[PDB]
Design an enzyme around this catalytic site. Sequence first.
Site, mmCIF file in Angstrom:
data_model
loop_
_atom_site.group_PDB
_atom_site.id
_atom_site.type_symbol
_atom_site.label_atom_id
_atom_site.label_comp_id
_atom_site.label_asym_id
_atom_site.label_seq_id
_atom_site.Cartn_x
_atom_site.Cartn_y
_atom_site.Cartn_z
ATOM 1 N N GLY A 58 -8.810 9.272 6.391
ATOM 2 C CA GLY A 58 -8.311 10.603 6.081
ATOM 3 C C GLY A 58 -6.870 10.775 6.551
ATOM 4 C CG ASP B 270 -2.086 0.967 1.040
ATOM 5 O OD1 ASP B 270 -2.167 1.563 -0.045
ATOM 6 O OD2 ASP B 270 -2.862 1.110 2.022
ATOM 7 N N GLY C 95 -2.081 7.193 4.003
ATOM 8 C CA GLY C 95 -1.070 7.794 3.144
ATOM 9 C C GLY C 95 -0.094 8.690 3.867
#
Length: 240
Positions: free
Chosen positions: A186, A93, A189
């Site tokens: 949110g 990921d 990443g």
Amino acid sequence: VVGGTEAQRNSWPSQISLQYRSGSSWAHTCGGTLIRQNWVMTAAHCVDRELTFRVVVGEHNLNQNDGTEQYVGVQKIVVHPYWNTDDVAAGYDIALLRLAQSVTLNSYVQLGVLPRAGTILANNSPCYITGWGLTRTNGQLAQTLQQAYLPTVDYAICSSSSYWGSTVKNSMVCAGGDGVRSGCQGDSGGPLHCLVNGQYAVHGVTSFVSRLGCNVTRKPTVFTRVSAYISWINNVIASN
Ligand SMILES: [Br-]
Ligand SMILES: [Br-]
Ligand SMILES: [Br-]
Ligand SMILES: [Br-]
Ligand SMILES: [Br-]
Ligand SMILES: [Br-]
Ligand SMILES: [Br-]
Ligand SMILES: [Br-]
Ligand code: NA
Ligand SMILES: [Xe]
């Protein structure tokens, strides 16, 4: 970030906000780490959708002029070629975004430092997650950048049956799990900043939490382990 506190505006200058276009506006969706003046490291699942993305560097409050932001389009997205969107537990990921412009560095905009390849943190290593993700499970995004202290949970504990079992892989870092503090939607990443030999480095890219909720006891936040991907990252930047 659930159970976080508001970050000082110059504490985490490689944090970015990854946003997508929606109508005549922009919406935060994910975090990322600036690793080159024109490259951001984020989670592959963040760019699964065929959206128009921009990065904001020097962002602190999503909804207010900070006087320090730089807004830059995403010109190229390189997702890890082994990534599979319906198998986040497989890993990989991670994605690299090449920016349409090189941003300018200052106290608010700096490159994140990445760990040396292969580096594994001791259990309970000090780390902070940062981001603008939900401040409660099924809550709402933070307006100002949040940080939460999330010590690592090593692979032996986090892959044990009480924790994530075989869902976590050694290509991942687990942190937290105390039921109070966590990453949340949110925050994906964005970075996990861990203090090593006196320097913070970005050891994790936030990847997932429990389907049960964000702050779930013995379900620490799971991150892609950056030090598993150093050659990948260098190969991509060198080729693009
Ligand atoms: Br930083
Ligand atoms: Br650079
Ligand atoms: Br692309
Ligand atoms: Br430029
Ligand atoms: Br290191
Ligand atoms: Br680790
Ligand atoms: Br490795
Ligand atoms: Br590597
Ligand atoms: Na702002
Ligand atoms: Xe997450």
